[PDB]
Coordinates of C-alpha atoms and ligand atoms in Angstrom, one line a residue:
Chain A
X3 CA -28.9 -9.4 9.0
X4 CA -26.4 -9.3 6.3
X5 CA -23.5 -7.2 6.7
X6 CA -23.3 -3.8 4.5
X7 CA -19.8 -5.5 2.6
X8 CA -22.0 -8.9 1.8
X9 CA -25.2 -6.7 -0.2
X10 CA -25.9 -7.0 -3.8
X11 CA -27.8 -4.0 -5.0
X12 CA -30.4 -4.2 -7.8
X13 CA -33.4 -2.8 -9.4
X14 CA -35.6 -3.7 -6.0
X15 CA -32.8 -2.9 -3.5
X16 CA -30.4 -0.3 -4.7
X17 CA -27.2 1.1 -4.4
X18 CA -28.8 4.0 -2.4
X19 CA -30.7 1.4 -0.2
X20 CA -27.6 -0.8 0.5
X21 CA -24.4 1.5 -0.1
X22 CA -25.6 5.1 0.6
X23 CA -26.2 8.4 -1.3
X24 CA -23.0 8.8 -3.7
X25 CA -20.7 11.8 -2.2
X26 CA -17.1 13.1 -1.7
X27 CA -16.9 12.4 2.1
X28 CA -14.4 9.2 3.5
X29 CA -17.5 7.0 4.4
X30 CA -19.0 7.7 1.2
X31 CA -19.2 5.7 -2.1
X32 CA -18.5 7.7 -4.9
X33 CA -19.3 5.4 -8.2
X34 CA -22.0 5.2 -10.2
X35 CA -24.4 7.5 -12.6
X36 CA -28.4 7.7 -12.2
X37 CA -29.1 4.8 -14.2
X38 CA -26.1 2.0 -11.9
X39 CA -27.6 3.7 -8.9
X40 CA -31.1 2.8 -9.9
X41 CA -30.1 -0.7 -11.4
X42 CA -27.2 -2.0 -9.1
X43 CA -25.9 -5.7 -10.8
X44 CA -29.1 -5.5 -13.4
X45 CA -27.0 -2.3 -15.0
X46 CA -26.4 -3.3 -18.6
X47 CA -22.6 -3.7 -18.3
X48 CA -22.6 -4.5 -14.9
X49 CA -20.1 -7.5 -15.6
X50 CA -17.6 -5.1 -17.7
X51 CA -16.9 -3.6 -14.1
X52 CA -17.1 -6.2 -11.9
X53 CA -14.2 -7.6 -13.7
X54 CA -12.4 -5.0 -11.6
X55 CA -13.6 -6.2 -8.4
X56 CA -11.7 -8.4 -6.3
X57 CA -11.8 -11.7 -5.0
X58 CA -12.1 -11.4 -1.1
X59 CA -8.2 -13.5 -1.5
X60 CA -7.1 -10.4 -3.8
X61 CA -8.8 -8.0 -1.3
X62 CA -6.7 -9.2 1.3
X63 CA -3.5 -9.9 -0.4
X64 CA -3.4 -6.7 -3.1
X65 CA -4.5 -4.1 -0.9
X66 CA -2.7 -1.9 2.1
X67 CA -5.2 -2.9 4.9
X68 CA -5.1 -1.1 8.7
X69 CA -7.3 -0.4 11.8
X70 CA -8.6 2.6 13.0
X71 CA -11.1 3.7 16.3
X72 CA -13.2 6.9 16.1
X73 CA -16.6 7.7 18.0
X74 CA -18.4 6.1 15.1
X75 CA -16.6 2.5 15.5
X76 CA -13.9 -0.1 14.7
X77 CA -13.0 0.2 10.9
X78 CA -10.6 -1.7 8.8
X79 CA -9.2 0.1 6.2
X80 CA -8.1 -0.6 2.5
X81 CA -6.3 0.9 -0.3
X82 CA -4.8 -0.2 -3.8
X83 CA -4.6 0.0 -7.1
X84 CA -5.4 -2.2 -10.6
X85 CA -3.5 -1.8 -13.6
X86 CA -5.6 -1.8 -16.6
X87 CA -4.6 -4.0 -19.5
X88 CA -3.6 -1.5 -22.2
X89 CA -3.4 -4.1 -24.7
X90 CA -7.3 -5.7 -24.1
X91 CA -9.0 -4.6 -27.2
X92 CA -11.8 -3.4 -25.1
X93 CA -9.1 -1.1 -23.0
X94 CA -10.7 2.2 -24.3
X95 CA -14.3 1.5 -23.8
X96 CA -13.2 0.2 -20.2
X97 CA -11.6 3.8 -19.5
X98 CA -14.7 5.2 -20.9
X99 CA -17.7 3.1 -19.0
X100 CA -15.7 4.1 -15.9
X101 CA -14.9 7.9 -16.2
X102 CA -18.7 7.8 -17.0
X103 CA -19.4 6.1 -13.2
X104 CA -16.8 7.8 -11.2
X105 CA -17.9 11.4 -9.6
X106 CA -20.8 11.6 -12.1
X107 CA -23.2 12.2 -8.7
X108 CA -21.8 15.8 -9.4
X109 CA -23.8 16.4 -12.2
X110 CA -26.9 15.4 -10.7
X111 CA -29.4 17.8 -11.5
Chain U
X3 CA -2.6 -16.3 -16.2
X4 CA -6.0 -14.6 -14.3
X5 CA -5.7 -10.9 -13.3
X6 CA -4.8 -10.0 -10.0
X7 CA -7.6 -8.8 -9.3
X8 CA -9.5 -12.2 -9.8
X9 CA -6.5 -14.5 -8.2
X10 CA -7.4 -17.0 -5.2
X11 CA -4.3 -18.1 -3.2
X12 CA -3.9 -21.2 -1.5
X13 CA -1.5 -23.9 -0.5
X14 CA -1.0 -24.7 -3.7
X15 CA -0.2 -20.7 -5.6
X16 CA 0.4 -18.7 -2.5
X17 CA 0.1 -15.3 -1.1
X18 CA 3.6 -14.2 -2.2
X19 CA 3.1 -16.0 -5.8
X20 CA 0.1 -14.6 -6.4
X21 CA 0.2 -11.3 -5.0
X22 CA 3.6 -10.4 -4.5
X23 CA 6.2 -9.9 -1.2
X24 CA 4.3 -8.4 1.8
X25 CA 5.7 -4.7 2.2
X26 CA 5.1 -1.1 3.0
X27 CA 5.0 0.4 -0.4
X28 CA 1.9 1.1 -3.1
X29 CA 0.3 -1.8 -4.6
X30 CA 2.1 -4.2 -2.2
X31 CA 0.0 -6.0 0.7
X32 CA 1.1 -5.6 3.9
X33 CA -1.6 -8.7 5.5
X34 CA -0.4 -11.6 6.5
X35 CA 1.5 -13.7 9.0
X36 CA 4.0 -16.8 7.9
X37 CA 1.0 -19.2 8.0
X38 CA -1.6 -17.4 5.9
X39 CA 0.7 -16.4 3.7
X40 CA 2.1 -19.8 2.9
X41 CA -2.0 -21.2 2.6
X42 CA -3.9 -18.6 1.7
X43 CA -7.6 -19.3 1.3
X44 CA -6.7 -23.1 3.0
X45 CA -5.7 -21.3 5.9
X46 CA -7.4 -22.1 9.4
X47 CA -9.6 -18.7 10.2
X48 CA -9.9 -17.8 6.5
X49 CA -13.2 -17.5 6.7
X50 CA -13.3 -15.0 9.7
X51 CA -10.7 -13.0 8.0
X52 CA -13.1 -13.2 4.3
X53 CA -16.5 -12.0 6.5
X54 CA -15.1 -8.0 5.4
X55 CA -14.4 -8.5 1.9
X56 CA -16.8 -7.1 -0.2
X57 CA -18.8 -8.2 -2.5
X58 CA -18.2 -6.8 -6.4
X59 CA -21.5 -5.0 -5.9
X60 CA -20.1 -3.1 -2.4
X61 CA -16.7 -2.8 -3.6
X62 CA -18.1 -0.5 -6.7
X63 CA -20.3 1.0 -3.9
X64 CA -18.7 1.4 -0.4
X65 CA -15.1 2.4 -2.2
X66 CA -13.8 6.1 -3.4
X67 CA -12.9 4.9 -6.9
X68 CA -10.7 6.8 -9.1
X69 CA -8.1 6.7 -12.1
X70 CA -4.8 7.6 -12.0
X71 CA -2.8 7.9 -15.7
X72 CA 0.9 7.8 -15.4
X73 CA 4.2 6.7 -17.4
X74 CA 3.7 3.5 -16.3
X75 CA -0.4 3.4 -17.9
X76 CA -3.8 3.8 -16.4
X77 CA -4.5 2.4 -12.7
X78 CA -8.3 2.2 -11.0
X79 CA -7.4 3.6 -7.7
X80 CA -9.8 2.4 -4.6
X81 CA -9.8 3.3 -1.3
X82 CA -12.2 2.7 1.6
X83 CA -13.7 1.0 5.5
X84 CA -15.2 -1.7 6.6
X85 CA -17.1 -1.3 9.8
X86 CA -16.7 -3.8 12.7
X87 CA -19.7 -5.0 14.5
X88 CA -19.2 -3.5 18.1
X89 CA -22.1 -6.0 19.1
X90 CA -21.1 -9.3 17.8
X91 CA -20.1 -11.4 20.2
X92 CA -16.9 -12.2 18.7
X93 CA -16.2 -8.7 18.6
X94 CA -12.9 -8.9 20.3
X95 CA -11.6 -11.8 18.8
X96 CA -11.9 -10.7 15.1
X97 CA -9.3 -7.5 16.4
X98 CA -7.4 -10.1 17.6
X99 CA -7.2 -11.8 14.5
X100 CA -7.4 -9.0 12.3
X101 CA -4.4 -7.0 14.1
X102 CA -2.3 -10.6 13.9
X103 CA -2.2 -10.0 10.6
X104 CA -1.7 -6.4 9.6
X105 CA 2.0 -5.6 9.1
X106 CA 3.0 -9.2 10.5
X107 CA 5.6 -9.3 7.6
X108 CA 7.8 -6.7 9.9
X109 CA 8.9 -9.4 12.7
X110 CA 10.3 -11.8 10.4
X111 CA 12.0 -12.1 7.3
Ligands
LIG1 N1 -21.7 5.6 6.6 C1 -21.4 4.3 6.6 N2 -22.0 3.4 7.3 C2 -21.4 2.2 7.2 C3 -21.8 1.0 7.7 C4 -21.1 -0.2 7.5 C5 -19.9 -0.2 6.8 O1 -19.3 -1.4 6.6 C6 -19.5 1.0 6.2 C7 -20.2 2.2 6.4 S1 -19.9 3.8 5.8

């Protein structure tokens, strides 16, 4: 049994199946439209987002990390931010593909 | 020359090369003791510290993701918790490690 941090979604096991349902809540994920949630890393421009993610050295070095106990469990925590590169000719389209992604569960029908 | 996003420290380009001064404030890391940060991924018990980094698929659906547009550009915000196994038997020891590390930078220059 993989951990839930070690998955890969796609088209047979999806980011439903391995992430949970897209919401607002603190535990929940909130990225991704019908057709990522459906596709995970078979999405079409899967790799024009996952040039955002970090390596697990970045994760640990870029990001604020804690600790925290509730009834649920033992969590570690993480926050940061990325710059995006305002002079990479595809700087628009990136702003774009992830506006499209972020929150979009709220226009599920 | 890589994003930092996409960096790997080690002995060679360290924590503090790579990823900046550990610290309190936004964007700056606050993980790591003098040893890590000086090796990086060539550190001893890297691999029980890189067991909660996600992968690119869980980071894009574990995190709240968001985008923040200020004077200094556009930033992908992300913010989110890994849960602990209460039932591995190295429980107690990965808090042990895991605790070494967070804020570490405040007991020593
Ligand atoms: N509702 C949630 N369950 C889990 C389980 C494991 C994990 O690492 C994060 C979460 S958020």
């Amino acid at each position: 049994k993989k951990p839930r941090q070690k998955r890969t979604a796609t088209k047979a096991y999806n980011v439903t199946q391995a992430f949970g349902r897209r919401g607002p809540e603190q535990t929940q994920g909130n990225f991704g439209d019908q057709e990522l949630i459906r596709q995970g890393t078979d999405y079409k421009h899967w790799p024009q987002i996952a040039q955002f993610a970090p390596s697990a050295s970045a994760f640990f070095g870029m990001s604020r990390i804690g600790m925290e106990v509730t009834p649920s469990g033992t969590w570690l925590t993480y926050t940061g931010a990325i710059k995006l590169d305002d002079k990479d000719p595809n700087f628009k389209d990136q702003v774009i593909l992830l506006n499209k992604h972020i929150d979009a569960y709220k226009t599920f029908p």
